[PDB]
C-alpha cells in the first residue's frame, strides 16, 4: 500500500523520468545546475554579509550614555511642566517617551497632566500642531 521506507516514488515523478530516452538524464541535470545556481548565490550573499558585518566594528559602544537612576516624584516643578509641554509638541501621545524626557514623572501622571493642565497649557492646540508633522 506504501513503498519501502527510505525509497521515494511518486506517480508524478515516475512519468517525468520516462517521457523520453534522456528525460531521466535531463531532469537530473536541471537539478544539478539549480544546485550550483543556489550554492554560488549563497557564497555571494555570504560575502555581501561579511562586508556589512565589518562596518559594524566595535558595535555602538562609544555612543551609549550611562543610565540615570532617578526616584519617581509627584510634585510638578515649573521646570518639569515646561519640559512636558515641549515633549507633547514633539512626541504627541507617546507617554513612555514623555515620561523618559521628564525623568522623574512615570507614565500615569503624564496621563493625569494631559488632563489637569489641559486648559492652562492649551494642550489641545499643541497636539494639533504636532499632528501636522
Amino acid at each position: 500500500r506504501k513503498p519501502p521506507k527510505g525509497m521515494f516514488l511518486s506517480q508524478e515523478d515516475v512519468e517525468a523520468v520516462s517521457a523520453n530516452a534522456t528525460a531521466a538524464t535531463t531532469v537530473l541535470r536541471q537539478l544539478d545546475m539549480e544546485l550550483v545556481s543556489v550554492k554560488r548565490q549563497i557564497q555571494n550573499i555570504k560575502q555581501t554579509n561579511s562586508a556589512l558585518k565589518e562596518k559594524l566594528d566595535g558595535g555602538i559602544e562609544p555612543y551609549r550614555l550611562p543610565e540615570v537612576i532617578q526616584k519617581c516624584n509627584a510634585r510638578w516643578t515649573t521646570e518639569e511642566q515646561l519640559l512636558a509641554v515641549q515633549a507633547i509638541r514633539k512626541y504627541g501621545r507617546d507617554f513612555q517617551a514623555i515620561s523618559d524626557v521628564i525623568g522623574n514623572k512615570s507614565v500615569v501622571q503624564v496621563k493625569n497632566f494631559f488632563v489637569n493642565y489641559r486648559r492652562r497649557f492649551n494642550i489641545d492646540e499643541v497636539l494639533q500642531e504636532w499632528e501636522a508633522e
Binding site: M7, F8, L9, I42, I45, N49, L52, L56, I60, L83
Partner: protein
C-alpha cells in the same frame, strides 16, 4: 508440518481442500456433501503419508487399505479410486521403488520419448510402470541432459544443475531416500572482494545488500501499486524498473540538497536585511550622539528649550540604542541557525562509485539465479513462481548430480547418439525420424501411438529448425515458444591439488570493475570435499565469454584468485572445464525465464498436447498424439530439476489416461 497432514504439504497439496485436479477426477465428491469431502481428503493424505514414510517399495492398494482404519476403510471403492488417482499422476510409486506386483507380461500402446533428461526419464519410468512400451531417443551419448556431471579421477563437479532448493515439499526429497546421494548443506555466508583484491567492510556489505533488497521491493511497488507495466507500447522489464527506481532515488537526493541550501539562503538573506537595518541604525546613532554632545556643551544655566534639547536627544539616543540591541540578539539567533544548518547537510550522493559496483554484484547474483540479463525479465511476472518455493536448506550433491538420472535410466530402452530430426503425427499414429550423431547417414524410423517431446526450449526456439514438425506446430504453440525466455549461465571448474581458500566458506564473490562485466566470474563455489573451486559467469557476460578460449578464461580466474588470496598461494589448476550452454546444440541455453511480454500462462501453453486433424474429412476428432514436458512446461516450478521431473510425471499420467483409460472417474 506433521501427521497425515505434512504428507499433503510434502506433496504440494492443500491438506484441507480438493485441488482442480481432484475435482476433475472426483466430481461426485466435490459437489457432494462436506463430510464425504473430508473423508476423501483424509484418505488422500493418509495414502500419501504411507508412501512418503517408506518410498523404497511400491504402495499397493491393499497394503493401503490394510492401514486405513474405520470409518475410512469402509468405502473400498473410494479407497480404490484415491489410490489409483495418486498412482496414475505420480504422487505415489514414482522414482525408483521395489515392485511388489511384477510387470504385466504384455505391454499396451507404444510411446516414443524425445530426450532422456530428467523430464524424459521420469515419464518413461512412469509409462513403463503403467504397462506401456517406451523408448527414449537421446541426441547425446549420455543421459541427464542439463544434469551434466564432470568426472576425472576423484574430481567431481556438476556443470548443470547443482543445488536442491530445499526438501520441504520437494519431490527430489523422495528421490534422495530412493537413490543415495550425499546431500550437503550450503552455508549462505558470502564475503565480497572488490577488484583491488580485498574484502568489503561489513559496514558496506550490509548497506548495499539492504539497498539491493529495498530497490527490489521498490520495483514490486512500481508494478503492483502504480501499474508501471508499459512504456511506448512495449512491456516493462525488471532492469528498466530498477533503473527508474535508482534514478528517482538520485533525484530525491538532489531535491534534498536543493531545499536545504534554499533554507540557508532564506536565512542568509533575512540576515542581509538585518545588517542593513543595523548599518542605518548605527549611522543614526553616530549622528544623534554628536547632536547630544553639542547640546550638552551649551553650558548651564540655560533656558528651558535648550534643557529640552539635552533631555530629548538623550531619550532619542537610548531609544535607538535599545532598538540596535534587540537587532543584536536577533543577529545572534540567525548566526547560530546558519552554523547549525550548514553543519547538518544531507546525503551528498545516493550511491558512490564503489557502492554502485558492489550493488552490481547483487544484480549479477540475480542475473545468475534467473540465468538472464535483468533487461529481459518481465517486471510484472519474473517472480511468479516464488510463492511455491520449498522450505529448508539448499543442498548440493557431493557425488555429482549425474547419479539421479543414471539411476532413473535403469530398466529403460534408451537409444543414445540418436538425434531426432523430424516428428510426424497424424490421426492414426506417429513416426519419429532420427539419425545417428556419429554418422548422420544412418537414418532411423520409429512408429508409435504418441510422442513425448522433452526438447529444451532453446532447441524448439532454434531458427532454422533442428527438428521439423509434420504438420507444423500451430501458432498458439509457436508464439509461446517465441515469447518465452531461454536464458544462459556458465561454469568454470577449477581443479587444484590443495585447498588454499577458506574451507568454512562455501562461496565468495568478486565485485566487477564495471556494470557491463558484473557477471564475469563474479562468484566462487567451494562445496566439494576435494580441492575444486567453481566460478560462475552470469548476465550479459555469459553469452560473451563463450567466444573466448578456455585458457584465457582460466587465466582471468587465476588472476582474480591471485588478488584475493595472494600471488603465491594459488597454483596452476590440475584440470579445467569451461561450459558453453548456449553453444550446446542439444540445449542452446541453460533454462527458461519469464521474459518481458511473456507470463506464466505461456508455460501452460507449452504443456498442452497437440491433436492432429482427421486423415479423412468428416472423420471424428482424433486423440491427442504429441505431448510436451520439460522445465519450460511447468508454470509453478520452472527452470529447475524438480520441475522437470514433476512434468514428466504429469505427462505420463496424461498419456496413460488417454491410452490406457482412467477407470477412477466413476
Amino acid at each position: 508440518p506433521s501427521g497425515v497432514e505434512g504428507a499433503a504439504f510434502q506433496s504440494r497439496l492443500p491438506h484441507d481442500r480438493m485441488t482442480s485436479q481432484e475435482a476433475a477426477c472426483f466430481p461426485d465428491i466435490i459437489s457432494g456433501p462436506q463430510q464425504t469431502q473430508k473423508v476423501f481428503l483424509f484418505i488422500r493424505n493418509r495414502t500419501l503419508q504411507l508412501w512418503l514414510d517408506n518410498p523404497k517399495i511400491q504402495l499397493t492398494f491393499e497394503a493401503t487399505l490394510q492401514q486405513l482404519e474405520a470409518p475410512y476403510n469402509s468405502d473400498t471403492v473410494l479407497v480404490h479410486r484415491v489410490h489409483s488417482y495418486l498412482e496414475r499422476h505420480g504422487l505415489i510409486n514414482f522414482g525408483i521403488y521395489k515392485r511388489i506386483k511384477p510387470l504385466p507380461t504384455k505391454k499396451t500402446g507404444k510411446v516414443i520419448i524425445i530426450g532422456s533428461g530428467v523430464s524424459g526419464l521420469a515419464a518413461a519410468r512412469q509409462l513403463q510402470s503403467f504397462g506401456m512400451d517406451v523408448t527414449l531417443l537421446e541426441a547425446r551419448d549420455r543421459v541427464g541432459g542439463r544434469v551434466a556431471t564432470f568426472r576425472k579421477g576423484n574430481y567431481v563437479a556438476d556443470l548443470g544443475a547443482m543445488v536442491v532448493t530445499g526438501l520441504g515439499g520437494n519431490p527430489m526429497a523422495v528421490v534422495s531416500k530412493q537413490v543415495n546421494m550425499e546431500l550437503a548443506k550450503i552455508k549462505q555466508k558470502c564475503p565480497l572482494y572488490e577488484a583491488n583484491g580485498q574484502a568489503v567492510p561489513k559496514e558496506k556489505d550490509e548497506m548495499v545488500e539492504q539497498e539491493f533488497n529495498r530497490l527490489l521491493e521498490a520495483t514490486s511497488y512500481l508494478s503492483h501499486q502504480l501499474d508501471f507495466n508499459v512504456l511506448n507500447n512495449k512491456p516493462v522489464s525488471l532492469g528498466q524498473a530498477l533503473e527508474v527506481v535508482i534514478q528517482l532515488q538520485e533525484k530525491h537526493v538532489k531535491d534534498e540538497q536543493i531545499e536545504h541550501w534554499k533554507k540557508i539562503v532564506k536565512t542568509q538573506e533575512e540576515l542581509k536585511e538585518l545588517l542593513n537595518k543595523m548599518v542605518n541604525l548605527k549611522e543614526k546613532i553616530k549622528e544623534l550622539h554628536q547632536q547630544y554632545k553639542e547640546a550638552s556643551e551649551v553650558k548651564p544655566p540655560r533656558d528651558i528649550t535648550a534643557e529640552f534639547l539635552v533631555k530629548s536627544k538623550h531619550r532619542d539616543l537610548t531609544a535607538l540604542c535599545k532598538e540596535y540591541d534587540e537587532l543584536a540578539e536577533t543577529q545572534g539567533k540567525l548566526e547560530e541557525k546558519l552554523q547549525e544548518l550548514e553543519a547538518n547537510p544531507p546525503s551528498d550522493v545516493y550511491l558512490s562509485s564503489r557502492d554502485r559496483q558492489i550493488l552490481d554484484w547483487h544484480f549479477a547474483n540475480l542475473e545468475f539465479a534467473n540465468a538472464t540479463p535483468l533487461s529481459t525479465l518481465s517486471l510484472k511476472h519474473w517472480d511468479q513462481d516464488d510463492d511455491f518455493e520449498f522450505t529448508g536448506s539448499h543442498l548440493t550433491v557431493r557425488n555429482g548430480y549425474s547419479c539421479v538420472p543414471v539411476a532413473l535410466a535403469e530398466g529403460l530402452d534408451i537409444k543414445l547418439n540418436t538425434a531426432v530430426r523430424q516428428v510426424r503425427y497424424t490421426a492414426s499414429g506417429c513416426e519419429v525420424i532420427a539419425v545417428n550423431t556419429r554418422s548422420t547417414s544412418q537414418t532411423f524410423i520409429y512408429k508409435c501411438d504418441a510422442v513425448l517431446c522433452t526438447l529444451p526450449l532453446g532447441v524448439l526456439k532454434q531458427q532454422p529448425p533442428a527438428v521439423q514438425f509434420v504438420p507444423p506446430l500451430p501458432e498458439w504453440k509457436t508464439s509461446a515458444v517465441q515469447r518465452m525466455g531461454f536464458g544462459n549461465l556458465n561454469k568454470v571448474v577449477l581443479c587444484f591439488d590443495r585447498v588454499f581458500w577458506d574451507p568454512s566458506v562455501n562461496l565468495f564473490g568478486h565485485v566487477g570493475s564495471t556494470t557491463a562485466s558484473r557477471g564475469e566470474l563474479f562468484l566462487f563455489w567451494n562445496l566439494y570435499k576435494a580441492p575444486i573451486l567453481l566460478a560462475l559467469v552470469a548476465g550479459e557476460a555469459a553469452g560473451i565469454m563463450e567466444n573466448i578460449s578456455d585458457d584465457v578464461i582460466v587465466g582471468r580466474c587465476l588472476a582474480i584468485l591471485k588478488g584475493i588470496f595472494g600471488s603465491s598461494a594459488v597454483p596452476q589448476p590440475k584440470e579445467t572445464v569451461v561450459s558453453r550452454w548456449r553453444a550446446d546444440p542439444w540445449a542452446r541455453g541453460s533454462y527458461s525465464y519469464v521474459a518481458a511480454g511473456s507470463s506464466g500462462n505461456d508455460y501452460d501453453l507449452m504443456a498442452q498436447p497437440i491433436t492432429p486433424g482427421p486423415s479423412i474429412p468428416g472423420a471424428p476428432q482424433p486423440i491427442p498424439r504429441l505431448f510436451f514436458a520439460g522445465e519450460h512446461t511447468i508454470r509453478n516450478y520452472p527452470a529447475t530439476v524438480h520441475g522437470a521431473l514433476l512434468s514428466g510425471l504429469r505427462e505420463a499420467g496424461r498419456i496413460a489416461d488417454q491410452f490406457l483409460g482412467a477407470m477412477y472417474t466413476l
